[PDB]
């Protein structure tokens, strides 16, 4: 059971090092993904993180939607929009058939307020054929569990006609009770390229 | 015993992914923490990391005290002050009752010189009620072990009266033998919010 | 006869205020003129006027060909090219029939060396039909007199076909003895629009 234990621990570390899933993230910015900043909701304005230089206040810092397709998910490394309803459109790195989606949020044990009520609760994933298309093809509707693990995966719906997509829209319908904003740490898109 | 082994390794990975401690870091910059630049020692000047652009020398690069409340603890991602005595004042993200502190330094197996003599040896942690206070309330006096693990935790002193703090001062009294500077990689503050 | 004296002095001041000539300068930059930097001589670089900020030396200042179509003719407000042979191509503000040209240089009484050896001596003016025309039509060969007035005017040649031009080339063939460079303070183009 000794060699069996080491093989199990090494396989777990191997899966952990491969973006925690071992699956391609076609939305990852460094890999070819990008945020359509025009098709996104207005960023929540806080005006608290004052950046200064030589005592001269320069600007307030706020995370852009780009962080949602960036791996660093330490507390604060998330994009926030006002309210409990928001839109986020991501251009995938390749034309793929979407098969699964991954949503990440910080655990409650790392949140300063003691809760993760800013996390999204009910959301849906849509597939768009072009940039200016308002209503896309529904790829699935899911619910992020606040009592679950930090990383949660969601299997996409099976479709009769295998239509490919390179543009995905993430529509957040509700959060877990935060009255001001809703935070998105990382959103991943998985599938098979054409 | 296979399912028992998988549960053990997965629990260890879960704690490792949660900032290696599973506890809120109220000093983390991205989470709300900030450095009081006017209440810190001067950065040790080396004049070695020359940043240039189009062959035009711009400035020498040295880490500011901000990296101490940033998670990257690769060799060099540390703030250094001249001598073996320095001060670092951190504004916590929330008004909390401090319970423990965490000090991180690179292991000897990753240091080029083969030693961590730039690491702090004797230090103390104080709690300040406001910025204008000179000498604060002692929260504990500890010693970072060079022969210990990279991450070392220190329990705060027990107090009969429960006084809260949002400003913490880290006073380094000595290092592990480096004659020029002393490096701080990461300093964490743990506790319970009010 | 006091009113005749006032009328004479006021008439002289009126002509003086009208760019000292009372004629349109179709080469003036602020009025629509511009320098074709692709077809000008290389600016004589001296690297003496060091511009610095906060004790940091930034760059050496040298006048561009633009000053030749700018009215300030104080000593130094001139474009210099290496040697005694240079050329300057100016795009006129309007398509005109060139009738006269004006060359300005500081008087000897204002030059530090007590002479103006950097002033142009022998030059010619050509009319170009397009920016890429290698050889233009000769509009006149003139000579700037160092013993003459500061402002000197030169009448263009009368030609059978009065072809209009919007691009003028000033070819300097010699200076008044300066062994290093040749300075042009202001060059004007006068004529009748089409």
């Amino acid at each position: 059971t000794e060699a069996q234990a080491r093989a199990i621990v090494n396989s777990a570390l191997k899966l952990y090092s491969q973006d925690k899933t071992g699956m391609v993230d076609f939305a990852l910015e460094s890999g070819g993904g990008s945020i359509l900043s025009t098709r996104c909701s207005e960023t929540y304005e806080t005006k608290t993180a004052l950046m200064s230089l030589f005592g001269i206040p320069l600007w307030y810092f706020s995370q852009s939607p780009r962080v949602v397709i960036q791996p660093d998910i330490y507390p604060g490394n998330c994009w926030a929009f006002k309210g409990s309803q928001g839109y986020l459109v991501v251009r995938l790195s390749m034309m793929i058939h979407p098969a699964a989606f991954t949503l990440e949020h910080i655990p409650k044990t790392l949140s300063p307020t003691g809760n993760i009520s800013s996390a999204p609760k009910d959301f849906a994933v849509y597939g768009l054929e072009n940039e200016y298309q308002e209503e896309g093809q529904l790829l699935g509707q899911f619910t992020y569990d606040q009592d679950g693990e930090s990383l949660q995966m969601f299997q996409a719906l099976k479709r009769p006609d295998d239509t490919a997509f390179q543009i995905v829209e993430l529509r957040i319908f509700s959060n877990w009770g935060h009255p001001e904003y809703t935070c998105l740490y990382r959103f991943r898109v998985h599938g098979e390229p054409v | 015993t296979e399912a028992q082994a998988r549960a053990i390794v997965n629990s260890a990975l879960k704690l490792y992914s949660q900032d290696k401690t599973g506890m809120v870091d109220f000093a983390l910059e991205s989470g709300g923490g900030s450095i009081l630049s006017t209440r810190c020692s001067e950065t040790y000047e080396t004049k070695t990391a020359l940043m240039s652009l189009f062959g035009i020398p711009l400035w020498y690069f040295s880490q500011s005290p901000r990296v101490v409340i940033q998670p990257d603890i690769y060799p060099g991602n540390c703030w250094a002050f001249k001598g073996s005595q320095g001060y670092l004042v951190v504004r916590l993200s929330m008004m909390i009752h401090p319970a423990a502190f965490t000090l991180e330094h690179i292991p000897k197996t990753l240091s080029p010189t083969g030693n961590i003599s730039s690491a702090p040896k004797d230090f103390a942690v104080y709690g300040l009620e406001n910025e204008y206070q000179e000498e604060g309330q002692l929260l504990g006096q500890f010693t970072y072990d060079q022969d210990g693990e990279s991450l070392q935790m220190f329990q705060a002193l027990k107090r009969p009266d429960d006084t809260a703090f949002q400003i913490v001062e880290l006073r380094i009294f000595s290092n592990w033998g480096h004659p020029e500077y002393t490096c701080l990689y990461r300093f964490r503050v743990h506790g319970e919010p009010v | 006869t006091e009113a005749q004296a006032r009328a004479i002095v006021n008439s002289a001041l009126k002509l003086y205020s009208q760019d000292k000539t009372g004629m349109v300068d179709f080469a003036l930059e602020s009025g629509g003129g511009s320098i074709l930097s692709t077809r000008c001589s290389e600016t004589y670089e001296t690297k003496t006027a060091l511009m610095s900020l906060f004790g940091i030396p930034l760059w050496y200042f040298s006048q561009s060909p633009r000053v030749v179509i700018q009215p300030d003719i104080y000593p130094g407000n001139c474009w210099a090219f290496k040697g005694s042979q240079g050329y300057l191509v100016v795009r006129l503000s309007m398509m005109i029939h060139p009738a006269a040209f004006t060359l300005e240089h500081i008087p000897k009484t204002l030059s530090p060396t007590g002479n103006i050896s950097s002033a142009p001596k022998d030059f010619a003016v050509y009319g170009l039909e397009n920016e890429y025309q290698e050889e233009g039509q000769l509009l006149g060969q003139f000579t700037y007199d160092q013993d003459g007035e500061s402002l000197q005017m030169f009448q263009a040649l009368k030609r059978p076909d009065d072809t209009a031009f919007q691009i003028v080339e000033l070819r300097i063939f010699s200076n008044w003895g300066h062994p290093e460079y040749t300075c042009l303070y202001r060059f004007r183009v006068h004529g009748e629009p089409v």
């Binding site: 998330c78 | 630049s37 500011s64 | -």
Partner: peptide, 26 residues
Amino acid sequence: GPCCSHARIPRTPYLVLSYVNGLPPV
């Protein structure tokens, strides 16, 4: 590389971060 021994190459420009209106979005 520096140009001469008297060259005044500046030190690190230090962009300071301060929280003046509470917590950032977390």
